[PDB]
Amino acid sequence: LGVYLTKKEQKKLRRQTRREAQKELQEKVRLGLMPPPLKEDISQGVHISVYRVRNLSNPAKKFKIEANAGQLYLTGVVVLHKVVVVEGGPKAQKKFKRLMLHRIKWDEQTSNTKGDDDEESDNKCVLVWEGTAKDRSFGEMKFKQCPTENMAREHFKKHGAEHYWDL
Amino acid sequence: ADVNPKAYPLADAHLTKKLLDLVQQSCNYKQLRKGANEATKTLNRGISEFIVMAADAEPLEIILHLPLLCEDKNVPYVFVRSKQALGRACGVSRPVIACSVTIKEGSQLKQQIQSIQQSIERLLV
Amino acid sequence: AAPEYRVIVDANNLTVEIENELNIIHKFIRDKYSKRFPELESLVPNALDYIRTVKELGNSLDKCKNNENLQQILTNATIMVVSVTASTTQGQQLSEEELERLEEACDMALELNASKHRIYEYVESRMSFIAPNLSIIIGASTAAKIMGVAGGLTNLSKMPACNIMGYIYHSDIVQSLPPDLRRKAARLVAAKCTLAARVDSFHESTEGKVGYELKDEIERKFDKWQ
């Protein structure tokens, strides 16, 4: 919240500010003092988000998602085939949401390293839901890989989260 | 205290703070038109981000055309309680009963404007 | 539909058309009667007074002062000046036919005038009901004009003063000032009429209290500028 003030309240302030200073200096010459010139989030509930993408292959993307999750105290997980989930205080999620959508470019091209050498690689992201949950059973943020679409559910299944995946 | 029921866009004390801050910033960035008259123009011209009015207006009717123009043009409008308060946020020593945050090219204020817009759209039910 | 304001707008327009035709008839009647009594027009400046006087006098100017109905129309001072001017007028009696056609158009004109008044009244009454406060500031008539163009009290209220300001300039209240002060006077009246219209759209101060405050507030500034 901010107050402004008018032209005449600038003068009066500027002059009464200046006056005190110069007269105080004046005495100093008379007196001879002066030669003469924490991860954030909310405990009661838990804000959450969920994201869904075609490819995660780029490592630079794989790495950021591990850092920021550990950087901001976001609980959650990530999965894929051969979705992303995040939970915390509402300030945390907003940062992370900004990252996933507006900062990071998932459509961008990268040259990956394989066991033999380096090769080129030439995907989109969109949010599904943000909301509120009785408790977040996620203990830590654990990126993983699943071969099928089923153990992928059983993975979330452990967390009673089967539903968060959308075909 | 009670406000005229007709000051349908009404902001609580929190939204009121944000609004007046953003108005004050818009006054600085020069995306601010102050006065019912100039706010009307920005609506007819199609250059209004959102509209803010004082439920304090003695002639409540003297600004009631704004929500109508707004509804047509699909522009968010909100009320605050105090026209003296709005005045101050507009740089003016005098009370200001309406004002308009106008569109500006590559505004630094864009994100904040977008955010305020959403809040106001929420109050409209 | 059938909003009363559109009725009053159109009634008020008639009034202007009748004013025009009345002006034209006066000019005609003055010209025709010029031969009987050429000096009279200069003596009776008010058109309607002049026409009523002509109808009364007719072909015989002499003894005009003695007439008891003409005493009802003009001031005694004036009656006496015309009477004296009649005795030395250089105009000749009219033919039966020119007298008769003169009388016919005089009757026409007074009938027109009575209807004009009947409508003026109707406009005043209804406007005082449709926009009591607005009316008080600029008069029923101007108020009806600005309402007609705007398309009603609600469409007028949703307008900013600067667009409401034209008719306000040509209003009485504004025109009672010296030309030098009219532009800023029109601006001022517009502003206050904008306030008055808004109150009126919500059917408040239905006795015109606001209209009156506003008027006096407007008149005071008029005095300041003088």
Which of A1, A4, A6 is facing B17, going by the closest CB pair?
A1
Question: What 8-state DSSP symbol labels residue C93?
Answer: P
Burial environment of residue B10 by CB neighbours within 10 A (0 to 12, 13 to 18, 19 or more):
middle
Q: How far apart are CA C181 and CA B16, in angstroms?
A: 42
* Owner of token pair 């609600």: C154
Closest CA to C93 of C168, C174, C20, C33: C33
Residue C21 CA: distances (Å) to CA of A166, C15, C32: 82, 10, 16
Closest CA to A52 of A102, A123, A155, A122: A123
- Chain B residues closer than 8 Å to A6 by CB: 91-93
Closest CA to B117 of B33, B5, B9: B9
Q: Do B21 and A1 touch (CB under 8 A)?
A: yes
Question: Angle C6-C156-B123 (CA atoms, 0-180°, nearest 5)?
Answer: 130
* Owner of token pair 């408790």: A135
B41-58 burial: b if 16+ Cβ within 10 Å, else e: bbbeeeebbbbbbbbbbe
Task: State the number of CA atoms in the 13 A half-sphere of B50 facing the CB.
Answer: 24
Question: What 8-state DSSP symbol labels residue B78?
Answer: E
Q: CA torsion C57→C62→C68→C70, rounded to 10°?
A: 40
Helices (H) and strands (E) in chain B, counts: 5, 4
Strands B98-102 and B32-34: antiparallel
The tokens of C4 are what?
Answer: 């009363």
Tell me if residue A126 falls in helix, strand or coil.
strand
Q: How far apart are CA B51 and CA A156, in angstroms?
A: 46
Q: Do B60 and C202 touch (CB under 8 A)?
A: yes
Contact present, C136 and C143 (Cβ < 8 Å) = no
Q: How far apart are CA A149 and CA C214, in angstroms?
A: 77
DSSP per position, C38-69: TTHHHH--SHHHHHHHHHHHTT--TTGGG-TT
Contact present, B10 and B122 (Cβ < 8 Å) = no
Tell me if residue C102 falls in helix, strand or coil.
helix
Tell me if residue A7 falls in helix, strand or coil.
coil
Q: Report yes or no: B52 at the A interface, CB cutoff 8 Å.
A: no
Contact present, B99 and B91 (Cβ < 8 Å) = no
Contact present, C127 and C74 (Cβ < 8 Å) = no
Q: Do B41 and C160 touch (CB under 8 A)?
A: yes
Taking CB atoms and an 8 Å cut-off, how many pairs form between chains B and C?
A: 32
Q: How far apart are CA C74 and CA C76, in angstroms?
A: 6
Q: How far apart are CA B2 and CA B35, in angstroms?
A: 24
The tokens of A102 are what?
Answer: 């507006």
The tokens of C98 are what?
Answer: 């020119």
Contact present, A164 and A85 (Cβ < 8 Å) = yes
Interface of B with C (CB under 8 A): 36-37, 40-41, 59-62, 64-65, 68-69
Which distant-in-sequence residues (6+ apart) come within 8 Å of B89 by Cβ?
A2, A3, A4, B20, B21, B23, B24, B27
- Give the gap in angstroms from C-alpha A112 to the nearest C-alpha of chain B: 35
Question: Angle C176-C178-C182 (CA atoms, 0-180°, nearest 5)?
Answer: 80
Q: How far apart are CA A105 and CA A58, in angstroms?
A: 10
* Owner of token pair 């004082």: B54
Q: Mutating which of C133, C137, C155, C157 best tests the B interface, going by the most B Cβ atoms within 10 A?
A: C157
Which distant-in-sequence residues (6+ apart) come within 8 Å of B108 by Cβ?
B29
Contact present, C210 and C200 (Cβ < 8 Å) = no
CATH fold of B1-125 reads 60s Ribosomal Protein L30; Chain: A; (3.30.1330)
Contact present, B74 and B100 (Cβ < 8 Å) = no
How many other CB atoms are there within 10 angstroms of residue C179's CB atom? Answer: 7
- Give the gap in angstroms from C-alpha B111 to the nearest C-alpha of chain C: 31
- Stated resolution in angstroms: 5.7
Q: Do A2 and B24 touch (CB under 8 A)?
A: yes
Which distant-in-sequence residues (6+ apart) come within 8 Å of C173 by Cβ?
C137, C138, C139, C189, C218
Contact present, A116 and A64 (Cβ < 8 Å) = no
Q: How far apart are CA C175 and CA C224, in angstroms?
A: 17
Question: Angle B95-B100-B103 (CA atoms, 0-180°, nearest 5)?
Answer: 150
Q: Do B21 and A6 touch (CB under 8 A)?
A: no
Contact present, B47 and B101 (Cβ < 8 Å) = no
* Owner of token pair 């609506």: B43
Q: In terms of CA atoms, which chain B residue is nearest residue C162?
A: B37
Query: Do at least 3 CB pairs under 8 Å connect A with C?
Result: no
Q: How far apart are CA C206 and CA C202, in angstroms?
A: 10
- Residue by residue, what is the 3-state secondary structure of B29-74? CCCEEECHHHHHHHHHHCCEEEEEEECCCCCHHHHCHHHHHHHHHC
Q: How far apart are CA C59 and CA C33, in angstroms?
A: 9
Q: Do B65 and C158 touch (CB under 8 A)?
A: yes
